[PDB]
């Protein structure tokens, strides 16, 4: 019998796989007999053991085929086609709800019976994040609500401050909570066109550590980053559709997404200042360093920079009414789990431990 | 049986779709059973539920096909070919008539019983816009005339007020009324070839926020936009037919379209200044800002910016005789529908609120 | 039955069509029934209504086909091959005779009863053009004879003078009379290879708006242009074959065509000036301005730009015996028609109206 | 009969071969009759004599085939697909454990009776290396742990010092021990995008000899290398995923791997220094130089720069319990062999010979 | 019957022909009857007259075939695959032995019964070459050893001195002896990437006449070669594998080969001077110039350029025991032939003639 190109496409759609070689590689693993499959018996990775039994008969015939990459390319095109349909037609509030449902699905597995992490350590993460800025939950609620409402010329937030201040730490967490991509505009102007092509159909972008000019009085090395941005004003404004590049494509036309710009304390033009609706002054704090020096499980597990940590913070601090009505059911269950496995006295103690510069679990 | 490539091309033309992945993604939705289709039950997106039953049989066979992107590329080529044929053979009045018809069809959808907006909020839009310039209604009709008559040299309009003065606000609204593209002449002259190539077959160009030099005493930052335009004089003049580099292909030959140039108050070289038929001196108005600070639904819904708002202004103010003969059947229904929903005192009350800087609905 | 590729190729040849999306677009229009086609009844476009009845059968089978763009690419290459053979094997006098024959076919269609032009406005245009330069009729024949004779390094003419002087108007008219292309060598050496890549197999070239240096005391801005032309001497001399280049094709070695250079009062280096046969010293004339301010149909209809006005002038001022013996038959029918529809006193009145700077038709 | 593409794909995965021409050439060597094969009789290369008999019948039919390169491209893509699966799903400890197994398999071949290597020269290498820096086996273990844990912003080590200080020697041995790629960031910005794309799916990267500025007071020539690294800060930080590109590919998005930077005593910006967790200052030593003048075999055989030498140092110095549990059985077997063939006093005499700057084997 | 693709591949293997058009052209010449081929009867070209009679029957079916360039590309990729198997699996001693075998095969033809060359004139060349430097046969042997051992960093030789000193003459002779390529790193810093890509799988690389800066006090013009070479240090050192690229291929990772740098008397950085294991200063000398004015056959037949002359020099001067054991038996037969056809007094008279600046054969 022949290969079913449809059954491959189902696997690609269900695993949301948009890399041709990753799809090829995993579909090849299914060729071996399911009765003995060691990865299935060891339960190693979700995207194998769920699917092998359904796909085995087709994977065996796929392994003989002469067209293997042409099958996978069509299957990957289908996943990209789905994403472009969704990006035009869904409301941004529903896109965020779709993103949260995937993050809650991760949280089920990580803290599950087949779990691999401790919820007490991740809540220690929340306590460290709440110390970084005054009214941390208000800032994160403002950020979500801004990215959902997407008001013209009030679309970008500026994160400013000296070295090792936590601006990247917060940006990276927001960039996993919301789906998005990072962009580096410190490169020269003639490559900039392909670089900005990564924003195609993305919900959020982060421009990381934009180098300025006039840094020499502060010992900061100068560069063209700030000057490249001031050539891109209409990409920031979002009033008009802009023609985004891609390799092996024509220009493709859309509103370029909202985002975060991070920089050191350079000067900024008035023309560029008119685009940023909000500015966050990140401060180095000596006591926050002394905590991490004793509590390194946070960084080895990448806790304080993951989007799962901010979702746990929103589950703790915000009312249920500010989640969209469909996900309120799952959010309520998670509030009951955090009320079960902690107390307010432990959480108040954890914040005190961080502020004292001792170990959070002390 | 085989896929009908003809039926796919009918959907592509009926939905005016010229992106290959978008056509692919939407056509795959039709493979599911029509009797259960939740998107049809919700009547959510027009270009789904009008078509599913007509195309369902062909989508079941397309789902098994091994040629999916090959089919859709030819369907997209057919839509692109129609647009080129039109661009050579239609008169500019027919093009603008076909453009107004498309807008009017969207007005029927937005303000219907399946509607999503209130026509008062958009007539509030007309009241806000009419304050921005003296006699806005007549400046629009002069711009429309100029783009239809396309007289050599007498082709471009210059918008050159100070910062944050509404030049983008009017430019984006005129851009959607007529159809066109924004172009980035501030990017590098060795790739500007592939930027101007976006103007192939288009009706308007807007050259967004052209940077000059010599404004630095007034804090205006330097850039090369003005020097690039002063190299493109034959493109602006529109006497001769110029050569446009369509990406990955050899050049097209055509008259580069008319359009709007937006800039801050830099100096313009005398050689370039002659290319502009008329100039608009925008300014900040503090009362107009405070009106928006209260009437926030105007910004959130993009009401002050969409071409539907200028068309409602044209429907309200101008004599029916200024519109081409085939749309006069539609305009007069909308004139009756506008006089039905509004009194003149209410509209004067809107404009009075704008001049006082209070909310337009107050 | 099956698609016949010969029939598509014949349509492309007869319409002299060399763009693939344009050929695809028009041939698709023939798929509908001939008995009721509005386009065939309205007589809108010649290249439709002449051809639908012949091709209906093939266009119906073409709409079912899966190789549509493959057929059109071979058909366009047949038209491109024909231009290659002609430009290698014809004499330049026969090339110009072929070009005049094509323009007379337009004149038949324009002034025949299905057209829309008024010949009184075109002969007013002839009267207006003759005032732009002294002895204009001699100059056109001197330019034409130069392009037919093509003596080495005596191949280019220089159009020079103040801004707003009609040099582009006359150059664009002379271009349409001859054929040819415009090139903008103010675009950078970073891309200049593909710019001169437009001159392949052309009869005439216009280098538009060439920027010099050292014009600041005359308020002229500087640029690269004159240094690019003075780097391109091997192209302007035309003694030897030069390796012209266009993307996704090999270089083709040929003699680069002769042409017109348009510039303001920049300095021209002594090495470059030795490439020009003669210069024309344009300057503004006040009466020509006040004439166009009133005879405004000239600019709107582009009458002073079109080569049809220059050809109607050559019909008026030159002997029959300057034209080739194959075309003299048509020329005498047109010469009779201009006497039958005018008089000498009417033409004298038109020129005097231009000299008075009033409306030409008065 | 016909070619089995499955048998080629087995050989490609067996030999872990990812160059298409290399695979093609080696598989063609199997076409000749096995009964007489000179390379098999001579045992010259494992990847031949192990595999010829299994593959011969398929190679005989493959040698007739008209599609040979297409077959080999599918076989190579299957091997890149495997690596793409491993890099996303394995732990970094498993990756290193797998890599050590590959090196231990080479040691069995090198020091078998079929192999050419002499263990005394390779242990002479270990003695020399342990003199280059204090506590070398602690430094190596610390580095290996740092690469496994991959802690954000604590990922890169800086090797600094004079000319001929041994920093390249030690980096090359580490780079073989845990497989990675060397990158040249001294070339201009416009080629960096392709060059940085070599890091896709690699465990480790080394930036060799990055040129700075301000060296001229110390005879060191300036370059842009340090400025380029100061633009790439987010690649060094590794907090967020960056967009990496090959030629003729779309981008791959991943965390850019940990690494080593080697440089001479140019100044480092304070923004860049914060990315480096540990700096090693190398120094020239006369006894090491004079020793290498006498034990020339070390340099001819490339012993001091090979990862096998560092693995031998780890086997001799580190406890078994520091190695991963699944290879402790192999390490114990090698520890027994080393104590069987060396005393400590032989090795202490080797180190004394090195400190004396006489020949290691004296 | 059909084309045997295997027989075309055999011919490509036996002629080492790795150009697609050359293979196509030569194989097409076999289609004519071999009974009366004049190139065969005149024995004009070995790659023809040896092979025509075997391939005639296949060339007749090849001449009718429609896939001719597809057959040739597979045949050429088979030769390229053989080279890449060899460059990894052979020892560098075998590579040089294989190269010397190929030169000896030419020499037997050149000096055979169909020989166009005269061994007297070529040994006149050996006499001239041995005068260019002291102890030339030891310089040559020291070079060969250095290339065969390829010791890290001790890899490159520098040829330095005034114009017309013979440094290119010796580099070209050593390049034809070993095989390899010449690279011009004076070309711009971006084209440099594909220029260096020519080194893939090569044995030698020769960098020709690299420009320094700061020589205008001694009439030597500035350039960028020495600044570029100081950026390529990791390629010269050969400690690490480096990334090499060809157009429309991704990078090949290998140790960049050893060889020779030729330069006039510019100053060299300490950083680059540390890479060179030996420097030769060449001085212009009058007697060699006056000899060549009378010994003109040397330049015309390119005798002093040729690796055949250096091999003849090694056969004359060096012991047999220095050559590899498999080639030694051919070396003995060539030593006998030189002692037969030259006495010592003939050769010593030639060296006296060179010193006298008279004709070598005088
Ligand atoms: N506010 C803070 N005060 C002190 N230490 C901090 C703070 N925030 C983060 N850190 C420490 O500094 C490390 C780096 O933080 P991070 O990269 O987020 O800073 P950044 O200010 O965004 O840096 P950069 O300017 O280099 O982009 C963290 O891993 C943590 O150990
Ligand atoms: N005439 C005006 N007076 C005051 N505020 C204005 C005016 N026009 C627009 N606004 C406010 O300024 C915001 C930005 O308007 P807009 O982008 O059109 O200005 P611009 O002058 O074109 O900007 P830029 O200087 O950035 O090119 C609007 O969203 C509105 O809030
Ligand atoms: N000789 C003239 N005297 C006065 N007005 C003129 C003259 N020639 C042209 N014009 C006016 O100037 C407009 C522009 O003409 P055109 O583009 O041919 O001028 P040009 O001198 O070639 O231009 P440029 O200075 O940009 O090279 C015309 O449409 C007409 O209205
Ligand atoms: N510590 C040392 N002391 C003396 N000589 C050394 C030392 N280390 C290496 N060498 C010698 O110098 C040669 C080059 O070593 P290597 O290339 O590793 O040095 P490096 O300091 O990294 O060089 P560079 O500054 O040129 O990049 C070695 O082959 C060895 O002969
Ligand atoms: N040692 C020498 N003394 C004088 N003339 C020489 C010497 N060697 C070669 N010649 C003459 O100089 C000519 C050029 O030699 P060659 O090109 O090898 O010199 P070069 O020093 O490498 O030159 P350049 O500096 O131009 O690269 C030879 O063909 C020969 O005629």
E107 in Cβ contact with E327 (< 8 Å): no
**Measured between alpha carbons, how far is E94 from E85 in angstroms, rounded to an integer?**
13
Q: What are phi and psi of B282, to 5 degrees?
A: -60, 155
* Closest-CA residue to B260 (of B187, B149, B167): B167
* C12 in Cβ contact with C78 (< 8 Å): yes
Q: What is the CA radius of gyration of chain B?
A: 23
Backbone angles phi, psi at C357, to 5 degrees: 70, 20
What angle do helix axes B52-64 and B20-29 make, rounded to 10 degrees?
A: 100
Q: How many CB atoms lie within 10 A of CB C231?
A: 14
H helix or E strand, kind and range, residue C244: strand C242-244
Tokens 């301010």 map to which residue? C293
- Distance between CA atoms of residues A169 and A340, nearest Å: 29
What is the rounded radius of gyration, in angstroms, for the C-alpha atoms of chain C? 23
CA separation for the pair D310, D176 (Å, rounded): 9
**């309009």: which residue's tokens?**
B157
Q: How far is the CA of B166 from the centre of ligand 2 (A)?
A: 4
Chain A residues with beta carbon closer than 8 angstroms to that of B220: 271
**How many interface pairs between D and E have CB atoms less than 8 angstroms apart?**
106
Cβ of B251 within 8 Å of Cβ of C24? The answer is no
CA dihedral C311, C314, C316, C322 (to 10 degrees): -140
> A with D: how many residue pairs have Cβ under 8 Å apart?
102
D81/A169 CB distance under 8 A: no
Region of residue C255 (phi > 0: left; psi between -120 and 50: alpha; otherwise: beta): beta
Q: Nearest CA to E22 among E30, E32, E12?
A: E12
- Strand partners of residue E322: none
Instruction: Decide if E234 touches D, using CB distance below 8 A.
Output: yes
Question: Which residue shows structure tokens 């190679």?
Answer: D59
Compute the distance between CA of residue A44 and CA of residue E250 in angstroms, rounded to an integer: 34
CA-to-CA distance for E208 and E183, rounded, in angstroms? 7
Nearest ligand to the C-alpha atom of residue C208: 3
Nearest to D51 by CA among D38, D40, D35: D40
Give SS3 for A101: helix
Helix (H, G, I), strand (E, B) or coil at C214: coil
Tell if the CB–CB gap between A240 and B182 is shorter than 8 Å: yes
C-alpha to C-alpha distances, A133 to A112, A282, A356, E136, nearest whole angstrom: 31, 8, 16, 77
Closest CB to C246 among B78, B242, B250: B250
Distances (CA, A) of E153 to D166, E236, E240: 12, 7, 11
DSSP A295: -
Q: Helices marked H in E133-280 — which ranges?
A: 136-149, 167-178, 192-196, 225-229, 233-237, 270-273
**How many Å apart are CA C313 and CA C183, to the nearest integer?**
27
Cα separation, B310 vs C273, whole angstroms: 54
Query: What chain B residue is nearest to A275 in terms of C-alpha separation?
Result: B164
In chain E the first and final C-alpha atoms are separated, in Å, by: 64
Instruction: Provide the token pair at E86.
Output: 């060899």
- Work out the angle at residue C117's Cα, subtended by the Cα atoms of residues C113 and C120, and round it to the nearest 5 degrees: 110
Question: What's the CA angle centered on B306, arms B42 and A83, to 5 degrees?
Answer: 45
Radius of gyration of chain A (CA): 23
Give the side-chain half-sphere CA count within 13 A for B205. 25
SS3 E160: strand
Listed residue (D276, D262, D100, D238) closest to D179, CA to CA: D100
Put simply, the answer to whether D271 touches A172 (Cβ < 8 Å) is no
Q: Are C87 and C199 in contact (CB under 8 A)?
A: no
Nearest to E307 by CA among E99, E117, E158: E99
Ligand nearest to the CA of B300: 2
Task: Please give the structure tokens belonging to residue C85.
Answer: 């053979």
Closest CA to C102 of C10, C203, C204, C16: C16
Question: How remote is the CA of residue C167 from the centroid of ligand 3, in Å?
Answer: 7
Q: Candidates A169, A221, A355: which one to mutate for ligand 1, based on the most atoms within 8 Å of Cβ?
A: A169
Q: Which stretches of chain C are DSSP H helices? A: 5-14, 20-28, 38-42, 46-49, 52-64, 68-89, 92-111, 119-130, 136-149, 167-178, 192-196, 225-231, 233-237, 270-273, 286-292, 297-300, 307-317, 328-341, 344-355
Sign of the dihedral defined by the CA atoms of residues A125, A129, A131, A135, in that order: negative
Residue of E165, E293, E299, E304 to test ligand 5 pocket, by largest number of atoms within 8 Å of CB: E165
Pairing of strands C181-183, D156-160: unpaired
Question: Cβ–Cβ contacts within 10 Å for residue A188, how many?
Answer: 14
CB contact burial D25-34 (16+ within 10 A = b; e otherwise): bbbbbbbbee
**Residue in the block written with tokens 């000179």:** D38
The Cα of B288 is separated from the nearest Cα of chain C by a number of Å equal to: 39
CA distance D41 to D57: 19
| Closest Cβ–Cβ partner in A64, A206, A211 for D6 | A64
Facing E243 at nearest CB: one of D64, D175, D195: D195
Test D208 with E274 for CB contact under 8 angstroms: no
Three-state SS for chain D is CCCCHHHHHHHHHHCCCCCHHHHHHHHHCCCCCHHHCHHHHHCCCHHHHCCHHHHHHHHHHHCCCCCHHHHHHHHHHHHHHHHHHHHHHCCHHHHHHHHHHHHHHHHHHHCCCCCCCCHHHHHHHHHHHHHHCCCHHHHHHHHHHHHHHCCCCCCEEEEECCCCCCHHHHHHHHHHHCCEEEECCCCCHHHHHHHHHHHCCCCEEEECCCCCCCCHHHCCCCCCHHHHHHHCHHHHHCCCCEEECCCCCCCEEECCCCEEEEECCCCCCHHHHCCEEEEEECCCCHHHHHHHHHCCHHHHCCCCCCHHHHHHHHHHHCCHHHCCCCCHHHHHHHHHHHHHHCCHHHHHHHHHHHHHCCCCCC
The crossing angle, in degrees rounded to 10, of helices D92-110 and D307-317 is: 100
DSSP-based three-state secondary structure for C204: coil
Please name which of E311, E289, E313, E287 lies closest in space to residue E299, comparing C-alpha atoms: E289
* Alpha carbons C47 and C100: distance in angstroms, whole number: 20
Q: How distant, in Å, are the alpha carbons of D37, D42, D52, E133 from that of D33?
A: 7, 15, 9, 52
CA dist D179 and D97 (Å) reads 12
Taking the CA of residue A165 as reference, the ligand 1 atom at the shortest distance is 21
Q: How many CA atoms lie within 13 A of C287 on its CB side?
A: 13
Beta-carbon contacts of residue D2 (< 8 Å; ≥ 6 apart)? D61
The answer for residues whose C-beta is within 8 angstroms of residue C259's C-beta and 6 or more apart is C155, C156, C157, C180, C204, C205, C206, C207
Distance CA E120, CA C93 (A): 65
Is E52 annotated as belonging to a binding site? yes
Could you please report the per-residue DSSP string of A45-85?
Answer: -HHHHTTHHHHHHHHHHHHH-S-HHHHHHHHHHHHHHHHHH
CA angle in degrees (0–180, nearest 5) for D62-D64-D65: 65
Q: Read off the DSSP letter of residue C216.
A: G
Taking the C-alpha atoms of residue C123 and residue E246, their distance in angstroms, rounded to an integer, is: 63
Strand partners for D242: D254
Beta bridge partners of E259: E205
Whether D79 and A73 have beta carbons less than 8 Å apart is answered as no
Instruction: Give the span between the Cα atoms of B258 and C298, in whole angstroms.
Output: 19
Structure tokens at B253: 């030959």
One DSSP character per residue, E306-357 reads -HHHHHHHHHHHS-GGGS-TTTHHHHHHHHHHHHHH--HHHHHHHHHHHHHT
Helix axes A136-149, A119-132, angle to 10 degrees: 90
Q: Does residue E300 sit in helix, strand or coil?
A: helix
Question: Strands C242-244 and C252-254, how do they pair?
Answer: antiparallel
Instruction: Please list, in sequence order, all residues whose beta carbon lies within 8 angstroms of the beta carbon of residue E247, skipping any fewer than 6 positions away.
Output: E194
Phi-psi region of B179 (alpha: psi -120 to 50; beta: other; left: phi over 0): left
Q: Is C280 helix (H, G, I), strand (E, B) or coil?
A: strand
* Method of determination used here: cryo-EM
Secondary structure element (H or E) that encloses residue E15, with its range: helix E5-15
The answer to whether the CB of E263 falls within 8 A of the CB of E116 is: no
Tokens of A237: 């404004």
Of A234, A235, A223, nearest to A186 (Cα)?
A: A223
Is C205 within 8 Å of B230 (Cβ atoms)? no
Q: Could you write out the three-class secondary structure of chain B?
A: CCCCHHHHHHHHHHCCCCCHHHHHHHHHHCCCCHHHCHHHHHCCCHHHHCCHHHHHHHHHHHHHCCCHHHHHHHHHHHHHHHHHHHHHHCCHHHHHHHHHHHHHHHHHHHCCCCCCCCHHHHHHHHHHHCCCCCCHHHHHHHHHHHHHHCCCCCCEEEECCCCCCCHHHHHHHHHHHHCEEEECCCCCCCCHHHHHHHHCCCCEEEECCCCCCCCHHHCCCCCCHHHHHCCCHHHHHCCCCEEECCCCCCCEEECCCCEEEECCCCCCCHHHHCCEEEEECCCCCHHHHHHHHHCCHHHHCCCCCCHHHHHHHHHHHCCHHHCCCCCHHHHHHHHHHHHHHCCHHHHHHHHHHHHHCCCCCC
Strands D242-244 and D252-254 turn out to be: antiparallel
Torsional class of B214: left (φ above 0), alpha (ψ -120 to 50), beta (otherwise): left
Partners of B204 in the β-ladder: B180
- The secondary structure element, H or E, covering residue E242 is strand E242-244
Helix (H, G, I), strand (E, B) or coil at C283: coil
Task: List chain A residues with CB under 8 Å of D149.
Answer: 300
Instruction: Tell me how far the alpha carbon of residue B176 is from its chain's centroid.
Output: 2
For residue E167 and ligand 5, the question of a CB distance below 6 A is answered with yes
Q: Which residues partner with C242 through β-bridges?
A: C254
**Chain C residues closer than 8 Å to B152 by CB:** 299, 302, 305
Distance CA E78, CA E72 (A): 10
Give me D225's structure tokens. Answer: 């290398």
Cα distance between the two ends of chain D:
64
Q: Alpha-carbon distance B257 to A30, whole Å?
A: 57
Among left, alpha and beta (phi > 0; psi -120 to 50; other), residue C281 is beta
- Scored b (16 or more CB within 10 A) or e, E98-107 reads ebbeebbeeb
Cα–Cα nearest to B29, from B72, B62, B67, B6 = B62
In angstroms, the CA D13 to CA E199 distance is: 28
* Length of chain A (residues): 362
**Positive or negative torsion for Cα E286, E290, E291, E292:** positive
Matching residue, tokens 């103690």: A349
3-state secondary structure of E38: helix
**Are A158 and A259 within 8 A, CB to CB?**
no
Q: What residues are paired with C205 via a beta bridge?
A: C181, C259
DSSP per residue over C36-61, as a string? Answer: G-HHHHHT--HHHHTTHHHHHHHHHH
From atom 25 of ligand 3, which residue's Cα is the shortest distance away? C163
**Which residues pair with residue B252 across a beta bridge?**
B244
Query: How many of the other CB atoms lie within 10 Å of CB of A291?
Result: 22
Chain D touched by A292 (CB under 8 Å) = no
CB contact under 8 A, B243 and C181: yes
* Rounded-to-integer distance, Cα A223 and Cα C149, Å: 57
CA–CA separation, D57 and B4 (whole Å): 45
The answer to whether the CB of B303 falls within 8 A of the CB of B124 is: yes
Degrees (nearest 5) of the Cα angle A313, A315, A317? 65
Q: Cα–chain-centroid distance for residue B67?
A: 35
Beta-bridge mates of residue B183: B207
**Is E90 in the D-facing interface, judged by CB distances under 8 Å?**
no
Length of chain B: 362
Alpha-carbon gap, residue B254 to B88, rounded angstroms: 10
Mapped onto helix, strand or coil, the DSSP state of residue C81 is helix
Indicate the helix (H) or strand (E) that contains E205: strand E204-207
| Beta-bridge partners for A279 | A158
Beta strands (DSSP E) in chain A are 156-160, 181-183, 205-207, 242-244, 252-254, 259-263, 276-281
* A248 class by beta-carbon count within 10 Å (0-12 exposed, 13-18 middle, 19+ buried): exposed
The Cβ of residue C299 has, within 10 Å, a number of other Cβ atoms equal to: 18
Q: Is B25 close to A82, i.e. CB distance below 8 A?
A: yes
Residue pair E51/E16 in contact by the 8 Å Cβ criterion: no
């Amino acid at each position: 019998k022949q290969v079913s190109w449809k059954l491959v496409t189902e696997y690609a759609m269900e695993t949301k796989c948009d890399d041709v070689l990753l799809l090829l590689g995993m579909y090849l693993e299914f060729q071996y007999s399911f009765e003995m499959c060691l990865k299935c018996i060891k339960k190693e990775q979700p995207s194998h053991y769920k699917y092998h039994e359904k796909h085995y008969a087709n994977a065996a015939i796929f392994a003989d085929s002469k067209n293997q990459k042409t099958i996978c390319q069509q299957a990957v095109d289908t996943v990209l086609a789905k994403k472009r349909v969704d990006s035009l037609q869904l409301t941004r509030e529903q896109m965020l709800t779709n993103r949260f449902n995937d993050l809650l699905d991760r949280m089920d597995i990580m803290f599950g019976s087949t779990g691999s992490a401790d919820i007490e350590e991740w809540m220690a993460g929340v306590a460290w994040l709440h110390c970084l800025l005054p009214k941390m939950d208000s800032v994160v609620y403002d950020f979500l609500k801004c990215m959902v409402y997407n008001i013209p010329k009030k679309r970008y937030w500026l994160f400013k401050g000296p070295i090792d201040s936590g601006k990247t730490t917060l940006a990276a967490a927001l960039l996993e909570l919301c789906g998005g991509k990072a962009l580096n505009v410190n490169l020269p102007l003639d490559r900039l066109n392909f670089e900005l092509g990564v924003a195609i159909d993305q919900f959020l972008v982060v421009f990381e550590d934009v180098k300025g000019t006039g840094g020499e009085s502060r010992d900061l090395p100068s560069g063209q980053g700030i000057n490249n941005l001031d050539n891109l004003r209409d990409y920031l404004d979002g009033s008009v559709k802009v023609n985004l590049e891609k390799k092996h494509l024509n220009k493709r036309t859309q509103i370029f997404p909202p985002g975060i710009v991070t920089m050191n304390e350079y000067s900024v033009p008035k023309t560029l200042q008119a685009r940023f609706v909000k500015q966050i002054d990140f401060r180095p704090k000596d006591y926050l360093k002394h905590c991490l020096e004793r509590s390194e499980f946070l960084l080895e597990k990448r806790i304080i920079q993951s989007g799962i940590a901010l979702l746990l913070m929103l589950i703790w601090y915000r009312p249920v009414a500010e989640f969209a009505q469909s996900i309120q059911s799952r959010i309520v269950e998670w509030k009951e789990r955090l009320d079960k496995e902690f107390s307010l006295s432990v959480y108040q103690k954890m914040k005190f431990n961080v502020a004292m510069g001792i170990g959070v679990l002390d």
